Amino acid sequence: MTTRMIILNGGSSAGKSGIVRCLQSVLPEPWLAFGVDSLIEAMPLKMQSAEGGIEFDADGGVSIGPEFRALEGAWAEGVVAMARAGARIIIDDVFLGGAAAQERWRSFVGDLDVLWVGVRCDGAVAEGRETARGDRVAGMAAKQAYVVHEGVEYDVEVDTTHKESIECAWAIAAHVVP
Amino acid sequence: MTTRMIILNGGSSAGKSGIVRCLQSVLPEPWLAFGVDSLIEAMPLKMQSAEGGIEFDADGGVSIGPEFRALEGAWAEGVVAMARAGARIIIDDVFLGGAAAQERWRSFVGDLDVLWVGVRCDGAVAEGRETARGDRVAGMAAKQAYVVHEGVEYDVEVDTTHKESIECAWAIAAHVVP
Amino acid sequence: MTTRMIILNGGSSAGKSGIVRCLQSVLPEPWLAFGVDSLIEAMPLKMQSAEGGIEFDADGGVSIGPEFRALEGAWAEGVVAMARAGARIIIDDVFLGGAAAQERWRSFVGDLDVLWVGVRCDGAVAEGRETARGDRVAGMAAKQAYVVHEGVEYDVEVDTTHKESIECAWAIAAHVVP
Amino acid sequence: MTTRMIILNGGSSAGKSGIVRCLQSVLPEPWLAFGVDSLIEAMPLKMQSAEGGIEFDADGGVSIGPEFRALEGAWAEGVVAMARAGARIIIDDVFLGGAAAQERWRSFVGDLDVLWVGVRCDGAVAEGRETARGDRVAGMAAKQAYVVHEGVEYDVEVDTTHKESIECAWAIAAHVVP
Ligand SMILES: Nc1ccc([C@@H](O)[C@@H](CO)NC(=O)C(Cl)Cl)cc1
Ligand SMILES: Nc1ccc([C@@H](O)[C@@H](CO)NC(=O)C(Cl)Cl)cc1
Ligand SMILES: Nc1ccc([C@@H](O)[C@@H](CO)NC(=O)C(Cl)Cl)cc1
Ligand SMILES: Nc1ccc([C@@H](O)[C@@H](CO)NC(=O)C(Cl)Cl)cc1
């Protein structure tokens, strides 16, 4: 019943990264972090616009091709395999496909003990943060603030609109079975 | 016989990262990159000095505790699992333990089709690059330039002392069975 | 009476950078940003521990030698000269010496039209953010949260404890005479 | 006759940044570095595509509007003022307008003791490095490799095609009058 993998889902600028860094600092056992950003980084730069692999519209839009989806699948199985091997894994993703994305993750996780965390934040508030962070593709924060959660089932839900990262980290840590 | 995982070993500032970015650009199929640096990043910051996890001496020295070694093991199995799942994986590491480190990797890779690449660079030349890159822990380049290769068996060997990254990438790509 | 230079002072993690990026986005005329961080970057790496130039104690402490102070002076005169030349300049610093630091700045600014902004944030809250940002030298946020303001006179004061960056940017922009 | 400001000009990926970091490490007196990149950073993000301020064509092309040119002028006068104030200033720029750009700089420098350095690199070789560095706007290295030097007069010329950064730093330091 001991928790093997923590999986956070949230729109862009919702505050995921900062919670993950806080969780790593809060939790006593060492946890490895692997978000969707670290995946994008492990992919070839060409994979980044050359269709088949992710493409950002000037209006903060994101579209995923099959080339990308195939790589993402292999990666998913790798992190799950890390958990299964005994490592503690935190993963922050952006369920663009709502429940569909969660189903996709469930198929990989199998029967592993997972904590499904939901990170919410006000669309307008998240967009302001997008601006303060210096993000390039402006428009995402607002576009993803609500849709990414549709039909997604969580075990915990934090809202970073009025709560700090270190605080949402505490609410989440309390649901982690050692 | 098709190559599943490429594994580069080399001292610090030997030029590994740049070859990896070149390989990703050169090779036709998308390859995921996961070096030891990306691992360090996935670990909690505390894990970075609090004994048990990696510690950098002021003289460019590096020591690895058991806490770290355990996490590294789980990670190793995860990337191998990614290959096994069908993803193409490039991995740049620093075999501080020479052959011992390679044996450790062999135990995880199993019977997977791997390309063992060796990236060499002149100790003094590598140290100059360490300085030009703005690295903080000065001293590593020179300390690791030769020892990391002792007793290590490669399928290919490039030397970045007089050859460019894009060029070493070409010599390496030519040994990749599609 | 048109504002030539905006000068923010605040402890570490008080939120200065994000306000500066927001101001740049909010204000209609292009403003150049030059904090104390960009200065540290323009200095030689050796200047960073080799006494005479800034040194960070393991307890989040900071000490400035004369080598550093001399360079900082020349830099100060350069940014003022940029304003005088017609550029709009935002500057975020950390008045470690309270009023002393402000006097030091006044001597350089001369009779230039300046907006003295004060960015406050709860010491404990700022320290939590320090943790979420992944800062290395932990301890500064708390150590600087209050002292840096002692005896310092502001034209505006924002508190990022409960107000967002984009919001503090709005309160500040409203005091900028075009 | 003591050198007050060092000014390097070179195409993208020609190796300028690394020489600058080497010079800072080599030269005994602390030198402040301020390239054109640090300027771009001090400007508002909007200033980065919204015409009037710099815009990168998908083919590695760069165009500068008047909004940008005005800010650049004020900045130029600021760094010169820093030198005049007694600071030692290194500046790496990209003379897109060949001699025109140098004339523009001469008008700001005045009678200050300046070292005009020229950093050359093979267009094809520079483009390979552009790829290994992970630069986004591919195409610049090749487009700027030669034109940026047309009609420009140097006091020193280094070629990074076959010489290392630390080495070009040594050839340049030897022309610096203390
Ligand atoms: N499906 C998807 C994958 C990656 C991304 C990223 O570009 C980016 C957008 O804000 N995500 C993040 O910063 C997360 Cl850490 Cl919130 C967004 C959406
Ligand atoms: N065992 C070991 C693990 C990680 C590291 C890194 O700190 C660092 C030292 O240069 N390595 C790199 O930059 C590699 Cl990409 Cl060449 C060095 C050694
Ligand atoms: N005097 C002083 C100069 C620079 C610094 C920086 O190290 C650092 C500490 O948080 N400052 C910042 O991040 C500011 Cl932008 Cl708030 C702190 C204090
Ligand atoms: N005029 C001009 C100004 C800035 C730039 C930069 O985008 C960039 C292009 O490689 N320059 C650098 O990296 C320099 Cl350090 Cl070689 C290129 C050209």
JSON list of N, CA, C and O and ligand atoms in Angstrom, two decimals, chain A residues 11-13 16-17 36-37 56 92 94 96 133 140 144, ligand 1:
[
{"chain": "A", "resi": 11, "resn": "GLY", "atom": "N", "xyz": [-2.73, 22.61, -15.66]},
{"chain": "A", "resi": 11, "resn": "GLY", "atom": "CA", "xyz": [-2.48, 23.45, -16.80]},
{"chain": "A", "resi": 11, "resn": "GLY", "atom": "C", "xyz": [-1.11, 24.08, -16.67]},
{"chain": "A", "resi": 11, "resn": "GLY", "atom": "O", "xyz": [-0.44, 23.91, -15.65]},
{"chain": "A", "resi": 12, "resn": "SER", "atom": "N", "xyz": [-0.69, 24.79, -17.70]},
{"chain": "A", "resi": 12, "resn": "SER", "atom": "CA", "xyz": [0.59, 25.46, -17.70]},
{"chain": "A", "resi": 12, "resn": "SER", "atom": "C", "xyz": [0.53, 26.62, -16.72]},
{"chain": "A", "resi": 12, "resn": "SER", "atom": "O", "xyz": [-0.49, 27.29, -16.60]},
{"chain": "A", "resi": 13, "resn": "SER", "atom": "N", "xyz": [1.64, 26.85, -16.03]},
{"chain": "A", "resi": 13, "resn": "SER", "atom": "CA", "xyz": [1.74, 27.91, -15.03]},
{"chain": "A", "resi": 13, "resn": "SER", "atom": "C", "xyz": [0.83, 27.68, -13.83]},
{"chain": "A", "resi": 13, "resn": "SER", "atom": "O", "xyz": [0.66, 28.56, -13.00]},
{"chain": "A", "resi": 16, "resn": "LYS", "atom": "N", "xyz": [2.81, 23.49, -11.02]},
{"chain": "A", "resi": 16, "resn": "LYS", "atom": "CA", "xyz": [3.35, 22.14, -10.87]},
{"chain": "A", "resi": 16, "resn": "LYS", "atom": "C", "xyz": [4.83, 22.00, -10.53]},
{"chain": "A", "resi": 16, "resn": "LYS", "atom": "O", "xyz": [5.17, 21.34, -9.56]},
{"chain": "A", "resi": 17, "resn": "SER", "atom": "N", "xyz": [5.71, 22.61, -11.32]},
{"chain": "A", "resi": 17, "resn": "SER", "atom": "CA", "xyz": [7.14, 22.50, -11.05]},
{"chain": "A", "resi": 17, "resn": "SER", "atom": "C", "xyz": [7.54, 22.84, -9.63]},
{"chain": "A", "resi": 17, "resn": "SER", "atom": "O", "xyz": [8.28, 22.08, -9.00]},
{"chain": "A", "resi": 36, "resn": "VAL", "atom": "N", "xyz": [6.82, 16.29, -18.11]},
{"chain": "A", "resi": 36, "resn": "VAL", "atom": "CA", "xyz": [6.69, 16.24, -19.55]},
{"chain": "A", "resi": 36, "resn": "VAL", "atom": "C", "xyz": [7.72, 17.18, -20.17]},
{"chain": "A", "resi": 36, "resn": "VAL", "atom": "O", "xyz": [8.08, 17.03, -21.33]},
{"chain": "A", "resi": 37, "resn": "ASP", "atom": "N", "xyz": [8.19, 18.15, -19.39]},
{"chain": "A", "resi": 37, "resn": "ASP", "atom": "CA", "xyz": [9.20, 19.09, -19.88]},
{"chain": "A", "resi": 37, "resn": "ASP", "atom": "C", "xyz": [10.52, 18.37, -20.06]},
{"chain": "A", "resi": 37, "resn": "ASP", "atom": "O", "xyz": [11.22, 18.58, -21.05]},
{"chain": "A", "resi": 56, "resn": "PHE", "atom": "N", "xyz": [3.77, 24.29, -31.18]},
{"chain": "A", "resi": 56, "resn": "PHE", "atom": "CA", "xyz": [3.06, 25.37, -30.47]},
{"chain": "A", "resi": 56, "resn": "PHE", "atom": "C", "xyz": [2.49, 26.51, -31.35]},
{"chain": "A", "resi": 56, "resn": "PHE", "atom": "O", "xyz": [3.24, 27.27, -31.94]},
{"chain": "A", "resi": 92, "resn": "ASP", "atom": "N", "xyz": [4.95, 15.19, -13.33]},
{"chain": "A", "resi": 92, "resn": "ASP", "atom": "CA", "xyz": [4.01, 16.27, -13.60]},
{"chain": "A", "resi": 92, "resn": "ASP", "atom": "C", "xyz": [3.77, 16.32, -15.10]},
{"chain": "A", "resi": 92, "resn": "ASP", "atom": "O", "xyz": [4.70, 16.47, -15.88]},
{"chain": "A", "resi": 94, "resn": "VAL", "atom": "N", "xyz": [0.56, 17.29, -18.36]},
{"chain": "A", "resi": 94, "resn": "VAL", "atom": "CA", "xyz": [-0.54, 18.18, -18.70]},
{"chain": "A", "resi": 94, "resn": "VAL", "atom": "C", "xyz": [-1.55, 17.37, -19.51]},
{"chain": "A", "resi": 94, "resn": "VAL", "atom": "O", "xyz": [-1.42, 17.27, -20.73]},
{"chain": "A", "resi": 96, "resn": "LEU", "atom": "N", "xyz": [-3.80, 17.05, -21.68]},
{"chain": "A", "resi": 96, "resn": "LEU", "atom": "CA", "xyz": [-4.52, 17.77, -22.71]},
{"chain": "A", "resi": 96, "resn": "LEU", "atom": "C", "xyz": [-5.79, 17.03, -23.11]},
{"chain": "A", "resi": 96, "resn": "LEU", "atom": "O", "xyz": [-6.78, 17.66, -23.48]},
{"chain": "A", "resi": 133, "resn": "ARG", "atom": "N", "xyz": [6.80, 34.80, -15.40]},
{"chain": "A", "resi": 133, "resn": "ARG", "atom": "CA", "xyz": [7.84, 33.79, -15.52]},
{"chain": "A", "resi": 133, "resn": "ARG", "atom": "C", "xyz": [8.66, 33.99, -16.78]},
{"chain": "A", "resi": 133, "resn": "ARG", "atom": "O", "xyz": [9.75, 33.44, -16.91]},
{"chain": "A", "resi": 140, "resn": "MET", "atom": "N", "xyz": [-1.08, 29.73, -23.30]},
{"chain": "A", "resi": 140, "resn": "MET", "atom": "CA", "xyz": [-1.31, 28.38, -22.80]},
{"chain": "A", "resi": 140, "resn": "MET", "atom": "C", "xyz": [-1.99, 28.33, -21.44]},
{"chain": "A", "resi": 140, "resn": "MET", "atom": "O", "xyz": [-3.00, 27.65, -21.27]},
{"chain": "A", "resi": 144, "resn": "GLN", "atom": "N", "xyz": [-5.31, 26.05, -20.99]},
{"chain": "A", "resi": 144, "resn": "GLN", "atom": "CA", "xyz": [-5.29, 24.75, -20.31]},
{"chain": "A", "resi": 144, "resn": "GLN", "atom": "C", "xyz": [-5.83, 24.71, -18.88]},
{"chain": "A", "resi": 144, "resn": "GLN", "atom": "O", "xyz": [-6.07, 23.63, -18.34]},
{"chain": "E", "resi": 1, "resn": "LIG", "atom": "N1", "xyz": [0.78, 18.33, -23.16]},
{"chain": "E", "resi": 1, "resn": "LIG", "atom": "C1", "xyz": [1.66, 19.46, -22.76]},
{"chain": "E", "resi": 1, "resn": "LIG", "atom": "C2", "xyz": [3.05, 19.05, -22.64]},
{"chain": "E", "resi": 1, "resn": "LIG", "atom": "C3", "xyz": [4.03, 20.02, -22.26]},
{"chain": "E", "resi": 1, "resn": "LIG", "atom": "C4", "xyz": [3.65, 21.38, -22.00]},
{"chain": "E", "resi": 1, "resn": "LIG", "atom": "C5", "xyz": [4.71, 22.50, -21.72]},
{"chain": "E", "resi": 1, "resn": "LIG", "atom": "O1", "xyz": [4.98, 23.22, -22.93]},
{"chain": "E", "resi": 1, "resn": "LIG", "atom": "C6", "xyz": [4.37, 23.53, -20.60]},
{"chain": "E", "resi": 1, "resn": "LIG", "atom": "C7", "xyz": [3.24, 24.51, -20.93]},
{"chain": "E", "resi": 1, "resn": "LIG", "atom": "O2", "xyz": [3.09, 25.40, -19.76]},
{"chain": "E", "resi": 1, "resn": "LIG", "atom": "N2", "xyz": [4.14, 22.86, -19.31]},
{"chain": "E", "resi": 1, "resn": "LIG", "atom": "C8", "xyz": [4.66, 23.25, -18.12]},
{"chain": "E", "resi": 1, "resn": "LIG", "atom": "O3", "xyz": [5.34, 24.24, -17.86]},
{"chain": "E", "resi": 1, "resn": "LIG", "atom": "C9", "xyz": [4.23, 22.23, -16.97]},
{"chain": "E", "resi": 1, "resn": "LIG", "atom": "CL1", "xyz": [5.50, 22.00, -15.83]},
{"chain": "E", "resi": 1, "resn": "LIG", "atom": "CL2", "xyz": [2.96, 23.13, -16.15]},
{"chain": "E", "resi": 1, "resn": "LIG", "atom": "C10", "xyz": [2.18, 21.74, -22.14]},
{"chain": "E", "resi": 1, "resn": "LIG", "atom": "C11", "xyz": [1.23, 20.76, -22.52]}
]
